[PDB]
Design a binder for these strands. Structure first.
Lengths: 91, 92, 205, 100, 78, 89, 79, 92, 99
DNA sequence: TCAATATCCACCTGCAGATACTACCAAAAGTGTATTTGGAAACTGCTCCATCAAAAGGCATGTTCAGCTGGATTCCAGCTGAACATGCCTTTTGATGGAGCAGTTTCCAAATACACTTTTGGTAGTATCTGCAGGTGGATATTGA
DNA sequence: TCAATATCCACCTGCAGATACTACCAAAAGTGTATTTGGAAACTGCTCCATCAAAAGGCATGTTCAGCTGGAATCCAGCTGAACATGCCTTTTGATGGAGCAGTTTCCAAATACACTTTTGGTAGTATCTGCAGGTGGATATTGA
């Protein structure tokens, strides 16, 4: 198996799953496109807040979307599932 | 005793579509539209002044609220219009 | 008590001026004078009625007690309603009348509420809350009747609910020593004025 | 000598001021806030009315009704986003059928 | 790059925490796109709150207020 | 044909539920919260409630028929209405 | 009669058709009624609170509008 | 200069679970919880007074706001507690 | 001399709530009994959540509350989850749920 | 069924970070007291608009049929996961300066109050006029062949 | 494709329900002029924490293979829609109340200001103790046999 052990282990935990430097780098790159081309500084708690919120969003979306694979009689996650979940939520 | 925005809606309509009327059910929808946006913008402007410990609402608060609420190009044009209005109000 | 009678009593009491609440309560007599003395009648009305409702909760009040209270209230506030006259012709003790009236209405309609109270000049005040064969009665749209046993006259209040007037007239005519009934050419908001002229005609025909 | 005229507007500047003062939004209100807000409201009003009149013209009519407002709003990408949690009385739906 | 630092194993872990058994190979780009969309909306609101005040540092409260606007109240930082 | 009825009902704007049944139901629900008191209802309040309800139901049906097709079907099942409500929140 | 069987099959079929639905299962007519009852309960509970606060026995349109606005649903054409 | 609700949370905790502590991250969550509910209730109470043309916020507005916000049995118990508090505040 | 929390029988502050209501642009005037009612409500809700969280901590054989426990409490309760459904708890995780 | 291997589960040990406790203090925030004032409760009353019945005809109800679709089975090729060996990128740690935050002046802008003029909302009584319903004529797609 | 039948568009006429236009009015509200006040901008300084570097190794990357699953094609029976005849419930109308909404009074509860306690937040400094990681050590299911 291996998938069930990993699922059980990961639902039991609380820590963040994306690495920190990549997320920081992406967020800064996105910020610079606003601000009229100037580089803002960031507090650390701000980046942690943003990361927590993002991972929560993604986990909940994966939950809502694996309900549509089983609706269609499948086991494998496809992109149409994510698209339709986002549509029905209203995003 | 009751007051509304119908006069000004009718003026604007005769200003964009001179040949075109409007029914009474629709102007209710437009009056409801105007009351809703007012509340949203003023609510955001209330908080920005509270967050920053200010006791006065100015044009800057309204501008920031407009940027936050309205999407995209619509905010851009709204900002332009409000800025022009204030500019030529002050110069009189 | 049931949550539907608590609201009824609260709404009934909130209608009563503070200038005369104690008199009505004393006439009702459901609460003892000691309990009345326990209460403060100077704080705002909501708290006063909260206290009185708690007192009623300590006891066990039934829809009959609240109906008695409503009857007493209307004895003082007659003018709130428009009053109409009925006449009976072609003609039992009070208890027989009570039982016959009640049984007639209960036979015609499965769900009802009836109540009586006596008054000087051999008068009886009646309150009826109308129901159906499927549904419960409405306590807030009743019908009030004033009948004087030693006379063939009966006075009625104008309800915002028809469809039961002929049954009421039939019950009045049968429970008493009569067999027909008609409506007089008199109507007004002042019950005593109708009363005076009606008995003037009765005594001086 | 009216404030809406000084600013070049049709909407009321004094009324907006009074409504901001009475709504418990802040202890004070400046003088440019009412004009700025009135101008924004006028811009949005006219932007909707233009599209509604166009929809009426397409349907061969000279009078606007809520159906036209609904069509205007739902066929414009941004107004729908602004008014996406809103239902318009007597407006109906956009026609939409799809193949399986 | 900078969106390819959101790696295949990280996305797979996020999916497993959501209860996903199997995962197509095209999920890694779709997730990246939707994440990039989510951050843009929050970050500009944060920067707006940050510029109204005349400072050049994004604080946690700006992020919290932004998320509260989006309807995503967050507990823990303010 | 279903195709003519869909096209006709999408051009229209009138209400589809009859008034008196809706009024009866809404008054039956109200009396449970008022503790036996028969509240009055303005005429423009019931129309508001009806507009809102019909809009809600139409949009829900849209969202659900999006899920019938996802599963390879043409027929709408309760299976599909329940799941849309879960996802919407 | 149960006051919710007055929401008939044809009405539900019409709402579905306006929603683009081609075919409908016979079990959709009871599900819809429950959905509608839940929606109405939630709105009416809040509407009655607003009017009992004001010490009235009459539900106005503004009470309904306020309730809906709370529930996340904003309705324009009324006042 | 900074103020919080931690003292009172700690008291309540020692009042329900005398053997049990609380970490610093969690008390931040609880402080955020208290600030959110306050804002909601006071916001509803502000509107009810505006809808009915009142210039004063009383216990009745708070009670109605509690009924509107909170679901079911939780509102019932909250109403009971607030009513008792006011009752024994007045009687002193 | 005597506080108002004590008269009311509370731990939460009645003066601070009054101050925050007055300084928040909620209305022109503020009554005497509003802060008492509101403080009581807040105390009730805090106590409810803390009770549930302490129970969850004990089940896991711990002596100290952490955000995981609050999350479990909130999502295991049919009403608090409805009050806090648009809310994400930092360092709280998810409920175990397969299938 | 057998079972070694993970694997699970429990149990014990040590220690490091984080909690809880005590003392100081000082300031800013809440309490008590007395005065004045204005909002809101209490009571009247009147007109609007909500509710209750009645009459009928239009939409819904019930039955049958047949054509369409949902659901289970079989088969095969594509695609996912698992394992293993590399190595590259994240993490941790530390000197450094830029920006947030506090304190002081002052000056420009907002509130307060009185007079006066303008505007807007509502009613009476019109007069159009736009849009809907019905009627009729011309033209095409799809049903079945 | 042939073709009649609905059906589709289009045009027309008629009319009536609803929109624009006047009058008028008078009540409410907005504007203009002085005066006073205080909130926020502008300037200076300080120290905190956020950017920016350099090592170490642990997680990510790439290749290959085996098996699991998605998708397409059959087939069968269940079930939904369409059509027709009938009758019951909703729609429309007219008549009264009763409840909302406006008005007046007054009284009770709120703002305001000043003087006095008290409580809470922050800072050293103390210590202690909870839980995490490690490792021992007992004991279970599991996919290959």
């Amino acid at each position: 198996q291996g998938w069930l052990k990993e699922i059980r282990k990961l639902q039991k935990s609380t820590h963040l799953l994306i690495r920190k430097l990549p997320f920081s780098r992406l967020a800064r790159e996105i910020c610079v496109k606003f601000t009229r081309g100037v580089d803002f500084n960031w507090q650390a708690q701000a980046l942690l807040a943003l990361q927590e919120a993002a991972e929560a969003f993604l986990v909940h979306l994966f939950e809502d979307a694996y309900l549509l694979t089983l609706h269609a009689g499948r086991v494998t996650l496809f992109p149409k599932d994510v698209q339709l979940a986002r549509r029905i939520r209203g995003l | 005793r009751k007051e509304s925005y119908s006069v000004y809606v009718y003026k604007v309509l005769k200003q964009v579509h001179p040949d075109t009327g409007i029914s009474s059910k629709a102007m209710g929808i437009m009056n409801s539209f105007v009351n809703d946006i007012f509340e949203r913008i003023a609510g955001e402007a209330s908080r920005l002044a509270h967050y920053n410990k200010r006791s006065t609402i100015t044009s800057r608060e309204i501008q920031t609220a407009v940027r936050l609420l309205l999407p995209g190009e619509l905010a851009k044009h709204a900002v332009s219009e409000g800025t022009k209005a204030v500019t030529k109000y002050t110069s009189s | 008590m049931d949550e539907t009678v608590a609201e009824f009593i609260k709404r009934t009491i909130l209608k009563i001026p503070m200038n005369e609440l104690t008199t009505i309560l004393k006439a009702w007599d459901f609460l003892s004078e000691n309990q009345l003395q326990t209460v403060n009648f100077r704080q705002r009305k909501e708290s006063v009625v909260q206290h009185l409702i708690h007192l009623c909760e300590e006891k066990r009040a039934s829809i009959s007690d609240a109906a008695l209270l409503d009857i007493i209230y209307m004895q003082f506030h007659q003018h709130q309603k428009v009053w109409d006259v009925f006449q009976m012709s072609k003609g039992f003790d009070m208890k027989q009348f009570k039982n016959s009236f009640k049984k007639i209405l209960q036979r015609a309609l499965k769900n009802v509420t009836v109540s009586f109270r006596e008054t000087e000049e051999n008068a009886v005040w009646i309150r009826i809350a109308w129901g159906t064969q499927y549904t419960k009665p409405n306590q807030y749209k009743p019908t009030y009747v004033v009948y004087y046993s030693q006379t063939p006259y009966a006075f009625t209040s104008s309800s915002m609910l028809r469809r039961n007037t002929p049954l009421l007239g039939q019950a009045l005519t049968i429970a008493s020593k009569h067999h027909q009934i008609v409506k007089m050419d008199l109507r007004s908001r002042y019950l005593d004025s109708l009363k005076a002229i009606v008995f003037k005609q009765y005594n001086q025909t | 000598k009216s404030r809406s005229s000084r600013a070049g507007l049709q909407f009321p500047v004094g009324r907006v001021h009074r409504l901001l003062r009475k709504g418990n939004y802040a202890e004070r209100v400046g003088a440019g806030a009412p004009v700025y807000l009135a101008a924004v409201l006028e811009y949005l009003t006219a932007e909707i009315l233009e599209l509604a009149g166009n929809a009426a013209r397409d349907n061969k009519k000279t009078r606007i009704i809520p159906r036209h407002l609904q069509l205007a709003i739902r066929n414009d990408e941004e107004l729908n986003k602004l008014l996406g949690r809103v239902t318009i009385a007597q407006g109906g739906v956009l026609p939409n059928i799809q193949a399986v | 790059d900078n969106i390819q630092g959101i790696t295949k194993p990280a996305i797979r872990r996020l999916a497993r925490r959501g209860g996903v058994k199997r995962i197509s190979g095209l999920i890694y780009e779709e997730t990246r796109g939707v994440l990039k969309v989510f951050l843009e909306n929050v970050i500009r609101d944060a920067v707006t709150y940050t510029e109204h005040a005349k400072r050049k540092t994004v604080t946690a409260m700006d992020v919290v207020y932004a998320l509260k606007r989006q309807g995503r109240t967050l507990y823990g930082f303010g």
